[PDB]
Enzyme design. Structure first.
Site, PDB file in Angstrom:
ATOM      1  N   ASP A 132       0.823  -1.223   0.000  1.00 31.13           N
ATOM      2  CA  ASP A 132       0.000   0.000   0.000  1.00 31.13           C
ATOM      3  C   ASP A 132       0.851   1.265   0.000  1.00 31.13           C
ATOM      4  O   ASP A 132       1.222   1.761   1.064  1.00 31.13           O
ATOM      5  CB  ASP A 132      -0.934   0.022   1.229  1.00 31.13           C
ATOM      6  CG  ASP A 132      -1.994   1.091   1.129  1.00 31.13           C
ATOM      7  OD1 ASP A 132      -1.924   1.942   0.195  1.00 31.13           O
ATOM      8  OD2 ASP A 132      -2.922   1.066   1.974  1.00 31.13           O
TER       9      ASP A 132
HETATM   10  C1  LIG Z   1      -7.281   1.567   3.430  1.00 31.35           C
HETATM   11  C2  LIG Z   1      -6.979   1.035   2.038  1.00 31.35           C
HETATM   12  C3  LIG Z   1      -7.370  -0.440   2.023  1.00 31.35           C
HETATM   13  C4  LIG Z   1      -7.680   1.838   0.913  1.00 31.35           C
HETATM   14  N1  LIG Z   1      -7.352   3.282   0.977  1.00 31.35           N
HETATM   15  C5  LIG Z   1      -6.135   3.655   0.218  1.00 31.35           C
HETATM   16  C6  LIG Z   1      -5.026   3.974   1.240  1.00 31.35           C
HETATM   17  O1  LIG Z   1      -3.745   3.839   0.588  1.00 31.35           O
HETATM   18  C7  LIG Z   1      -5.168   5.338   1.969  1.00 31.35           C
HETATM   19  C8  LIG Z   1      -5.046   6.613   1.107  1.00 31.35           C
HETATM   20  C9  LIG Z   1      -5.091   7.854   1.988  1.00 31.35           C
HETATM   21  C10 LIG Z   1      -3.926   8.621   2.149  1.00 31.35           C
HETATM   22  C11 LIG Z   1      -3.899   9.761   2.963  1.00 31.35           C
HETATM   23  C12 LIG Z   1      -5.060  10.130   3.640  1.00 31.35           C
HETATM   24  C13 LIG Z   1      -6.229   9.399   3.475  1.00 31.35           C
HETATM   25  C14 LIG Z   1      -6.267   8.262   2.655  1.00 31.35           C
HETATM   26  N2  LIG Z   1      -4.200   5.461   3.058  1.00 31.35           N
HETATM   27  C15 LIG Z   1      -4.505   5.387   4.364  1.00 31.35           C
HETATM   28  O2  LIG Z   1      -5.625   5.227   4.828  1.00 31.35           O
HETATM   29  O3  LIG Z   1      -3.356   5.490   5.248  1.00 31.35           O
HETATM   30  C16 LIG Z   1      -3.606   5.175   6.612  1.00 31.35           C
HETATM   31  C17 LIG Z   1      -3.595   3.685   6.795  1.00 31.35           C
HETATM   32  C18 LIG Z   1      -2.310   3.403   7.571  1.00 31.35           C
HETATM   33  O4  LIG Z   1      -1.504   4.557   7.393  1.00 31.35           O
HETATM   34  C19 LIG Z   1      -2.400   5.662   7.395  1.00 31.35           C
HETATM   35  S1  LIG Z   1      -8.570   4.340   0.716  1.00 31.35           S
HETATM   36  O5  LIG Z   1      -8.020   5.661   0.645  1.00 31.35           O
HETATM   37  O6  LIG Z   1      -9.449   4.172   1.845  1.00 31.35           O
HETATM   38  C20 LIG Z   1      -9.354   4.124  -0.674  1.00 31.35           C
HETATM   39  C21 LIG Z   1     -10.321   3.132  -0.794  1.00 31.35           C
HETATM   40  C22 LIG Z   1     -10.979   2.949  -2.012  1.00 31.35           C
HETATM   41  C23 LIG Z   1     -10.669   3.750  -3.102  1.00 31.35           C
HETATM   42  N3  LIG Z   1     -11.328   3.544  -4.276  1.00 31.35           N
HETATM   43  C24 LIG Z   1      -9.707   4.753  -2.988  1.00 31.35           C
HETATM   44  C25 LIG Z   1      -9.036   4.933  -1.770  1.00 31.35           C
END
Ligand SMILES: CC(C)CN(C[C@@H](O)[C@H](Cc1ccccc1)NC(=O)O[C@H]1CCOC1)S(=O)(=O)c1ccc(N)cc1
Lengths: 114, 114
Positions: free
Chosen positions: A22
């Site tokens: 990720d």
């Molecule tokens: C949680 C995963 C499984 C999926 N996410 C992607 C992740 O890379 C997500 C991206 C992000 C970056 C910065 C702030 C907010 C969100 N990072 C994230 O949450 O960082 C946390 C988990 C630990 O460190 C901190 S998503 O954004 O929910 C998502 C879901 C579906 C779609 N179609 C697009 C995006």
């Protein structure tokens, strides 16, 4: 249950854990059976909101580049464990999108799966 | 303020958008003044919870191969746009951490001729 590609299995504290690789995750995440938890916590910003979560105690993580110690966020709300930039930087991984999937390779170009 | 690396800038709807390259994102995301929206939505399952967000209408995206038509999720709860597995597959992209920071290149190692 299992994450989509790119995924990788690592021995984490003597147990296999299959992670979603990720690049959008600043820190790495365990979801179920995280082992012993520490007293310390962190605010996690997700795509849909933010919540406070606990850090695990230190785990030995068996990276292809050599074993290291790492603490994970325990995020039971999260769909599966996440291998984020904190460990990808240590692994010096390459992620290749090819066909309809994705494969992880190491810093020497060695495949880390398949 | 740019997103953290790995990041890439692509023209969407005629103007540049700088994305966090995100292997953890099933679908690509815009976050601000996204233009016309479809009546359709998707459930987005984030690290900390889930809820629904609207799809945009089709956008011209300039990739390496030239123009593709792509729909994005509009997720204003996200701090920056995310280039997900949908478009990483279309770009046949590679992500490298073995360099300093993280870099994104095309199917044959060229920083994207986009
Ligand atoms: C949680 C995963 C499984 C999926 N996410 C992607 C992740 O890379 C997500 C991206 C992000 C970056 C910065 C702030 C907010 C969100 N990072 C994230 O949450 O960082 C946390 C988990 C630990 O460190 C901190 S998503 O954004 O929910 C998502 C879901 C579906 C779609 N179609 C697009 C995006």
């Amino acid at each position: 249950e299992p994450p989509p590609e790119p995924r990788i299995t690592l021995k984490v504290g003597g147990q296999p854990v299959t992670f979603l690789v990720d690049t959008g995750a600043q820190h790495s995440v365990l979801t179920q059976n995280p082992g012993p938890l520490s007293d310390k916590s962190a605010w996690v910003q997700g795509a849909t909101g933010g919540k406070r979560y606990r850090w695990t105690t230190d785990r030995k993580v068996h990276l292809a580049t050599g074993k290291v110690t790492h603490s994970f966020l325990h995020v039971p709300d999260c769909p599966y464990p996440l291998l984020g930039r904190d460990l990808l930087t240590k692994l010096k991984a390459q992620i290749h999108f090819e066909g309809s999937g994705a494969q992880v390779v190491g810093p020497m170009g060695q495949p880390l799966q398949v």
